A paper describes a structure:
The multiple functions of Sa_enolase encouraged further exploration, leading to determination of the crystal structure of Sa_enolase at 2.45 Å resolution. The non-ligand-bound Sa_enolase crystals belonged to space group P4212 and contained two monomers forming a single homodimer in the asymmetric unit. Structure alignment indicates that the two monomers are nearly identical, with a root-mean-square deviation (r.m.s.d.) of 0.2 Å for all Cα atoms. The monomer–monomer interface is vast and has a buried surface area of 1747 Å2. The dimer–dimer interfaces within the octamer form along the outer edges of neighbouring butterfly-like dimers and result in a buried surface area of ∼1287 Å2. Structural comparison of non-ligand-bound Sa_enolase with yeast enolase reveals that the non-ligand-bound Sa_enolase presented here assumes a conformation similar to the ‘open’ conformation of yeast enolase. Superimposition of the non-ligand-bound and PEP-bound structures of Sa_enolase reveals that conformational changes occur following ligand binding. The primary difference involves the orientation of L1, with residues 36–44 moving approximately 9.5 Å towards the centre of the active site in order to cover the catalytic pocket.
Numbering used by the authors:
A (entry chain A), D (entry chain A): 1 to 434
B (entry chain B), C (entry chain B): 1 to 42, 45 to 434
The structure:
């Protein structure tokens, strides 16, 4: 029954219109799994890199035929001839890491390897008749994540004078994930009206949120607040706010240079002034989470920021950790941050992904599983959040199926869990004292 | 074994963030089907059921529809011991159970959910690809895609009357190649827009709504993106419109001033035809959807006599996926193509009847998406099952659209050397 | 197929010769699970049900608990048609069926028996090793074992206050190697004791209770056995205590005179901390269990501030595998590790919640045996399922202990090249 | 279905902390059996010898990697390539005896061979859906054994001035095995109190019984009696006593030298005086069984002892017979003893074990299946006693799971047998006239 008999990859498209890898796994008894890999980075300092073709005359160089070939001609024959059972996730993942033989995964491609890794796990779940989350996390996978819902974009994703890349709402005060999703959409739609009445742009970006021409950061925040209240919810209690500052995008030579995005008179802040500024914002607005508040290399700044607001505010390393456990470990040992953004394709296997989540959790950090800019109809990250009782997810705004499909999968998971389902609300932030 | 043992509905979300119905069907032997219903309409149209509870989802909840499946439709199926393979008796039974031509008591969305999920479960039981279960052994023709790229009319702040502008990669050898071109043209257009300082964020169907100066600006810029990607506008890639002329038609006149400024022409039926013929003569346009008002039957006649031999004329608002109205169009020689919106008629059986009617009249049947979509890909399989030759399932952005394209890629891959992509020969309705 | 068709309990014996509960679960398809319950306690603790019939087993019979399974719990499961895979709903249902927080109406031992046997049967149905069914695909980390070797306090006639002395073979490469070392050290100690004319018979946990002269004699002799076996006390093998200080704590004072003669120090909270720090500075001690009284929260704070960065401080009596109390310890920064006794909380679900809480607070969760054990090996699989990193399951003597060790050997063997043994890195709770 | 497809051995630990062999057998249809071998002797005169590694730097020379290798590299390939069905116990056992080719089993190791032998039988029982006892003994295996329960130790297992190695209680007067076990524990626990009140040692030895510092043999016996009575049972009727004298341990040159263990003034008895002494003890105390009352080589003494008390007292050869049927046969032909201790690993296969039991039974002797000092979680000897309607077992005191697990298995066997179960009490001693 469980021996893997076929592993097949093909070229398909992601939510941005760019090629990506899809892999299908079949066992001798006919259990089946399909995996679609989200967009990645083909160059980087510390992450698994995906393999692109570079053929300027197909898909503007973004085709993934090489990665597809590597699956079909290198990985699949090793798996088939090895007679691996679909249940041996870790050996298969370890075999693929060694077969690529680079820390990068850049010989075979992180996209090739991950497609296989997830396809196998899904096939195993199908074979056992298990919901994926329980196969991945065992019998006690039951906690639905509080979602970080992208609502407004800035920085390099906007023309408006705003340095922070993304603003989010978090419906922590709901009692079920189902309710939390509802609130999200109500707030989203109310915001759309408000923007439309103001004559601002209503079309959406990659994450399915808005990038309107606000006057600045406070305009943006306060308008979100207004949308929360207009929908009938309370900002301090039921719905909270979050940032992805992506501060690396505007940091150079020890200066957080807000004028890269906020125009001539934007503040040029030192590390100590960046912290003061974020503390001010947090004392003013009901902000529960900040991603990349300091630069990916400003560890002293991260330290300062963690010492100052880390007891009562979640601080998420994205560019800081890059889903790398050697870097996460150094962060943990130095008391920097209290949360890590887990991007599955940035590390490249399910096994390594679960090791990062476990490492994070065991240090009292939160592990927030994350979408990419180019997503697919794959809903695996919803199952991973519940499998690990992660307590949080970041999978986009409240439009576009590349985002909504994950929310739908969470609805199905909560439904199926029935009376065993758990939604911890504010207690999901176990990384926080106050 | 094929007897249906569970029919279960659930409230989920569509691509616009509004509630829709999901239905799951199981047979005694463990075969499984899931359907999600696209966004619809709450005359002459199957209607979806919305809750109207101002405190939930702004009145757009579908708990009553979900409840109609679980408390009314499911027990009828289950107690009736219907086989999962008896698609037509199940659909028929649901139409009778609802009792109104509207499908308004149970909801088109309750009914269609079941209808699709039953078919998918049948395909699962039989080990068949869905397109082959639906269409028989000969379902093998991949559609030329109508790819939305620019929006106007009420979907834009720009002074353009027509609602959609489309590209059609007819000249490609395979569906796979044609999809590639779509994306390359689309990405070239994107960077041309940002180089002109125009807006790049997308709407419901994953396309652009840029502030162009006018209809000629939009078209000419689409053409330039096609050429900047290295494809020939006359032969490899054609253009298409959805004018949605019903939107700017008031009191016997096509009032472009509704969307196109203060000096937009007020146009008579004869002047519309002239303008459309002008555009067709001045640009490589192969299809026009709703070029005339839904009730301007005289105008439709005129337009079909004028350009029908060489341009596809698609009724959307004109036929509303209603076979009574389609029959009348055919009998009176109006149009040469019909947009099929599965949730607008409400069953798979009626959808296939509607397609069959169209095809037997020498019309093309263009299976279509809705503004609010889902992760569901059934419309891809319908297109191939009926060798329709065409599909309209959005731009090259948003998984709500791309998922359908991806499913066509899997279908073509699976079909291997039996797969067919006709290109310009897909337009069997066109005398030219 | 996964529906539970039989739940059956039976009176058997534990490793001390006292009655305990055995439960067997069967599914429709023939999948099978057997659990045996370890010895417990008849406040803030799940309680086991004892018969109290002075004419049977000296009042320790469990016929009423067995009867609660067979006449009350089983029919609820069977009539409810629970799937064997629905571990959390079954446990939840049993908690509600009992109704008291104690688990005192049905008995923690009735409930836990069912809970474990259901999981084992699920693992059997799925063809999965139990650690993988319980923990998901990534359960692969073998625990460093806390190996009891010498006993004191109320488990010895010798003048020693602390109840247990342990070795930890942290420096080993594999669990297999670490188990080997345990046995070699233990057998070397045995012959050193018989060469000194000291007692060699073993207690409940398979260790020794020799009449040493004092606490320094015991420790120094353990170290010598470690060195006589060719291992380095500082790096390869560390020591550990279970002081069980609650035992000699009266009226605000740690009264070593309870066990340590007539001139054993009466010690204040501050003087306990000093002494413990002294020992830690003078010997390679990596863990202390219950170094302070179960109710001396101020003292625990003090001790954790003092040595918590570099010594593991385990609450046993302090937390009583109760998440309300654990939460408070975490909130107040007391301890850095919790002893998990599955029968002290009473379900697998609550056990995993308790472990999860601990791990998420940066605490280690040390799965534990009880004085009265059985041939059951589930705690081995729990340790690996949760990648706990540690286990406390006895000395290197008695199958009640060795069976668990043997099961860890099978687990490691089965895991093959995926198996992990972290050694000193298992102490992720320790800043040093 | 029944063909053996895998035979696998590994190193595990016994109840004394020493390596032993564990073997697992699988058939093509997935029937499974696991066997753990108890401690043996690696040298001997007349027994199967187990194979130890002799590597002084692993497990102090007691590792069994060689035996494990022999299973995996010699026995398993013969079984797999031979395509033996799991049901052909005797051919497989005969094949292993010949493959080792020595009377000792010392080439491959008695531990290697037995592990396989039992694993196969268990797999066969699993394959057929049969309780093991019925597979081994056919449909009429239904008699629960009267247990010989170790309670007090002496001789070389004690510092106290007592020559006899072990003292036992036998709850012959109970009506079920279940009840008989209860009585055992009640007596055991009562004895523990009494000893504790006397200030004597309460820790346990290998068999889970006591080795306290009694004044001598009578002190020991009478204190056991006291514990019987204090628990509410009658010494002459419900509970009887037994010995393992292990008289070989203190015999030399025709002298039973009690001073080897009972100090300066211990009696030095001739063979005729040993018999008188045992007869005296039996007339004084309710002793129903004596193991190795005479030396393993003192056949004339054994004769004398059998002629004198053999009609009314059970006399068990352990060191005398060494589970060897050539020696048992000579004993039977010479009228020596009336019972034999069956140690499965001393002979080395299940087949040979059943031949010894059958030989014993057919001579009107009793066959008492026995534990070893180093035991395991294996419960096979419980099934063997019932399979053969042996009527007696010797599997230790009433503590330690290495002992209790056998008692538990007997409880399960009795339970499952239900109304067909049989516990003969005193009539189990069919070898006795009076
Ligand atoms: Mg239209
Ligand atoms: Mg303790």
């Amino acid at each position: 029954m469980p021996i893997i008999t076929d592993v097949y990859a093909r070229e398909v498209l992601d939510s941005r219109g760019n090629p990506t890898v899809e892999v299908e796994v079949l066992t001798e008894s006919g259990a089946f799994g399909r995996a679609l890999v989200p967009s990645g980075a083909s160059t980087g300092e510390h992450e698994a890199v995906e393999l692109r073709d570079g053929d300027k005359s197909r898909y503007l160089g973004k085709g993934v035929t090489k990665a597809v070939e590597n699956v079909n001609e290198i990985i699949a024959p090793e798996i088939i001839e090895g007679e691996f059972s679909v249940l041996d996730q870790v050996s298969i993942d370890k075999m693929m890491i060694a077969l690529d033989g680079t820390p990068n995964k850049g010989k075979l491609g992180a996209n090739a390897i991950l497609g296989v890794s997830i396809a196998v796990a899904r096939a195993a779940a199908d074979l056992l008749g298990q919901p994926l989350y329980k196969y991945l996390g065992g019998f006690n996978g039951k906690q639905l994540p509080v979602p970080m819902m992208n609502i407004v974009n800035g920085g390099s994703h906007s023309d408006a004078p705003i340095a922070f890349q993304e603003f989010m709402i978090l419906p922590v005060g709901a009692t079920t994930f189902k309710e939390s999703l509802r609130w999200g959409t109500e707030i989203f739609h109310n915001l759309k009206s408000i923007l439309s009445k103001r004559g601002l742009e209503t079309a959406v970006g990659d994450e399915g949120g808005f990038a309107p021409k606000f006057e600045g950061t406070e305009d943006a925040v306060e308008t979100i607040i207004q949308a929360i209240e207009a929908a009938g919810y309370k900002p301090g209690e039921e719905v909270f706010l979050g940032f992805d500052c992506a501060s690396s995008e505007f940091y150079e030579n020890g200066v957080y240079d807000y004028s890269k995005f906020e125009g001539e008179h934007g503040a040029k802040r030192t590390a100590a002034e960046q912290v003061d500024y974020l503390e001010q914002l947090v004392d003013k607005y009901p902000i529960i989470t900040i991603e990349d508040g300091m630069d990916e290399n400003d560890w002293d700044g991260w330290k300062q920021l963690t010492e100052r607001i880390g007891d009562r505010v979640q601080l998420v390393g994205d560019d800081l950790f890059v889903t790398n456990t050697e870097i996460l470990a150094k962060g943990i040992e130095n008391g920097i941050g209290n949360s890590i953004l887990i991007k599955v394709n940035q590390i490249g296997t399910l096994t390594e992904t679960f090791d990062a989540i476990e490492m994070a959790q065991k240090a009292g950090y939160t592990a927030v599983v994350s979408h990419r800019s180019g997503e697919t109809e794959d809903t695996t990250i919803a199952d991973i959040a519940v499998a690990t009782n992660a307590g949080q997810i970041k999978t986009g705004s409240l439009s576009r199926t590349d985002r909504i499909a994950k929310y739908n999968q969470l609805l199905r998971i909560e439904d199926e869990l029935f009376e065993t389902a758990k939604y911890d609300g504010i207690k999901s932030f176990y990384n926080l004292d106050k």
